[PDB]
């Protein structure tokens, strides 16, 4: 039955993404091959290849589910902060990015593996796809509330995403990441407090 195989193939796709996220999150992309991931998912190499043409193609789908969870957790952390003004929402969002990007799995897959496997253009495209809307919305609300000078929203959003992604990559490869994270949080908080009217 075609339907049976198609349901099992959809299940196989989920099992492979779950399996690869777990093993690559622990050991890194370079240290785990597709045969080990197929065994972990409990599926044949033939079923795996039917879903993902090669190792990089499975890695792209892992990045998507991780980035989905990163954005959901940033939104959850911002809501949990109880920020009462757009300026406080921005302060909470900056703190939320340093907390989420400090998760060892996000560090390994997004900050260390993804720039290498996706390349610069591919990494930029993913970061923008997931974060540009949230960032533009925070900026737009701050401007509407009179807490931020009216200025071009998309360019400010892109530049701030670049600053924050470079901050997280610096923390990811620091000799002392705990110190790097605390010092980065201080310079970002000073910069935001210099820019915001509130």
Ligand X SMILES: CCCNC(=O)Nc1cccc(C)n1
Binding region for ligand X (CB under 6 A): 63, 67, 70, 97, 110-111, 114, 123, 126-127, 130-131, 161, 164-165, 168-169
Handedness of CA 158, 161, 167, 170 (dihedral sign): negative
Q: How far apart are CA 175 and CA 62, in angstroms?
A: 28
Task: Indicate which of a second copy, ligand X, none lies near residue 152 (CB less than 5 to 8 Å, by partner kind).
Answer: a second copy
Task: Indicate which of a second copy, ligand X, none lies near residue 184 (CB less than 5 to 8 Å, by partner kind).
Answer: a second copy
Helices (H), the chain: 2-27, 34-41, 45-51, 55-81, 86-101, 104-106, 114-144, 153-172, 177-195
Choose between 43 and 181: whose C-beta lies nearer to ligand X: 181
Asked whether position 158 contacts a second copy by CB under 8 A, the answer is yes
- Choices 5-13, 30-38, 66-74, 114-122; region in contact with a second copy by CB under 8 A: 114-122
Q: How far apart are CA 58 and CA 43, in angstroms?
A: 14
Instruction: Kindly list the residues in this chain that would bind a second copy in the complex (CB under 8 A).
Output: 115-116, 119-121, 123-124, 149, 151-152, 154-156, 158-167, 169-170, 180, 183-184, 186-188, 190-198
């Amino acid at each position: 039955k075609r339907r049976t195989q198609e349901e099992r193939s959809a299940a196989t796709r989920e099992a492979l993404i779950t399996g690869a996220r777990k093993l690559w999150g622990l050991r890194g992309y370079a240290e785990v091959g597709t045969p080990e991931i197929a065994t972990e998912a409990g599926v044949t190499r033939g079923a795996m290849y039917h879903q993902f043409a090669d190792k990089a193609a499975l890695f792209r789908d892992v990045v998507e589910v991780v980035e989905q969870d990163v954005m959901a957790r940033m939104a959850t952390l911002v809501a949990a902060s109880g920020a009462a003004t757009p300026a406080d929402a921005i302060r909470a969002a900056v703190d939320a990015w340093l907390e989420v990007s400090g998760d060892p799995e996000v560090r390994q897959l997004i900050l260390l593996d993804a720039p290498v496997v996706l390349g610069w253009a591919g990494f930029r495209d993913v970061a923008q796809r997931y974060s540009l809307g949230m960032t533009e919305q925070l900026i737009t609300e701050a401007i509407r509330a009179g807490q931020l000078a009216r200025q071009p929203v998309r360019p400010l959003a892109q530049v701030l995403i670049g600053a924050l992604d470079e901050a997280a990559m610096f923390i990811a490869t620091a000799d002392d990441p705990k110190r790097a994270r605390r010092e980065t949080r201080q310079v970002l908080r000073r910069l935001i407090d210099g820019m915001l009217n509130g």
